[PDB]
Symmetry: C3
Subunit: 219 residues, 3 copies
């Protein structure tokens, strides 16, 4: 079951990538950079999840290490997408964007180190990752939202919608991680696998459908 769920996920990622590629050819005022980011996220994730489907991107708790290889690239790119949405039609703040990238890469590395750790040490690393996530959300709903508001009512309305979308999904990851085999071990592996199949379909493909459709409608 675990193998065919990962093959299915990789196929959905490939269809999302092809959809974003088709949109890119009639871009309706959205810069090519947004289409490139929207394609890299699912292709990279698709490849990492294909490695799990093939029996390769895990070692035996089972550590699904290919998830961290995925997220360490896909998650900073998602925050770049969200930052570029806030900045659409205005000056870029690349400092703020790279602040999110740095927090996010740190967050994913702490999760990988937490997974390889035992006891108190595990929850130290996990806590540092959660703190990085809180700072990401403070930026999202604070200074980054203020840039979105500076770019007019329609853009700020779209940004708010994708900020809530992204944030609601993002808080689910560390919650599932803590409940599952990597943390307290209350949730079963098969549950956790389905959560880390379904959540990222929404976080990667769903998010960029919502984001690119909104930005395109501003044309």
């Amino acid at each position: 079951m675990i193998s065919i769920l990962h093959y299915g996920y990789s196929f959905i990622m490939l269809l999302g990538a092809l959809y974003f590629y088709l949109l890119s050819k009639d871009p309706k005022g959205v810069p090519a950079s947004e289409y490139l980011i929207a394609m890299v996220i699912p292709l990279w994730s698709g490849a990492a999840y294909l490695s799990i489907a093939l029996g390769q991107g895990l070692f035996q708790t089972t550590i699904y290490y290919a998830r961290y290889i995925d997220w360490v690239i896909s998650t900073p790119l998602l925050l770049a997408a969200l930052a570029l949405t806030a900045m659409f039609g205005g000056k870029k703040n690349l400092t703020l964007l790279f602040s999110l990238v740095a927090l996010d890469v740190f967050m994913i590395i702490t999760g990988f180190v937490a997974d390889l750790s035992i006891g108190t040490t595990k929850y130290i690393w996990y806590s540092l990752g959660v703190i990085a996530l809180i700072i990401i959300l403070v930026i999202t709903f604070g200074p980054l939202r203020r840039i979105a508001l500076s770019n007019g009512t329609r853009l700020a309305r779209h940004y708010t919608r994708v900020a809530i979308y992204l944030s609601a999904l993002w808080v689910c990851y560390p919650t599932a991680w803590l409940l599952g085999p990597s943390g307290l071990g209350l949730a079963q592996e098969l549950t956790e696998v389905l959560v880390f199949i379904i959540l990222p379909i929404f976080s990667k493909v769903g998010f960029s459908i919502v984001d690119l459709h909104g930005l395109r409608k501003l044309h």
Copy 2:
């Protein structure tokens, strides 16, 4: 012999790097970034192949020359950056297209490494994903990236076309050698593969940048 071939390779990389350094001191309208990229590629490749010469950048698994992937994951995106910057010479940069090539290329090299670690059907899935990435890189090279070159005038576009064809002819030899040698079908012997992955990169790295830098320098006015 395999150790000595890697030492010789590393020495040629050093000479190439020092030659590009010397050109950089009299740049003839070529920006400093082209000289930097042309130096990093052979110095990085030189270090990676030195590790193979010393017996460190390889392991038994059949021998995996893993230091080749450490080499290519840096030197190959930089070579595509060089090609892209040639297409954009005298005109506006399209860094979105440049980074598209980087992303495709890093993915291609990683699928190679994973293919080398794999056995059976799995090996050929990773290899095929790498080949698809290469095909897209060549579609970009001869389609949108060439249209940028054509926008920068006749002489630049002629040079771009020479460099693009030179790169493409060498680049298709890599996955061809991979598939024929011990990592794939095991038709060619280890030594044969080693010599191909010594001689190809001398032309791909040092050769490419000699052609590219000389062609850009010739466009210089006074």
Copy 3:
């Protein structure tokens, strides 16, 4: 004691990061990028040294302990430190990102040769070490030559600040390979505990000390 020294270091990195965050809130003409770099350096280093304090970021190898988390630290914190130095030289003028990325490439190479030297034994170790020292010498040539000439092109006052931080950085930087060679990774003349103390005290000055000196001096131009 080694564990407690690392906990104390991480705490000092966190206090430094918080000080730079507080300065960033009233920035006095210094761009946000300088404050971000000044925060990332100590947070990253603090995390890497936390892994040593917890007993994770080290292993036994040749009957000696490799503090591998130092190289994880330095491969990110050291290129950021050179970026901070380069941005100081360019303050009030056109950026030279080519020269900045030249220093980043040299620096990342230098740290990687150190890591490989640490994993090596005999002649091989000193080959890798020597390549990293060559990279450091080139970094220092850049720092006191072309990068200082950029600082001089941004006027007397900026160039005086640049020269101060260039000397500060360089004096600490030459200590690292010196300690490395004397200590258990090299000749084994200095004891493990001495090398641990050196690689605690030096980085407090290199990371937090450097950004205090750099940011105070830039803020005073306001």
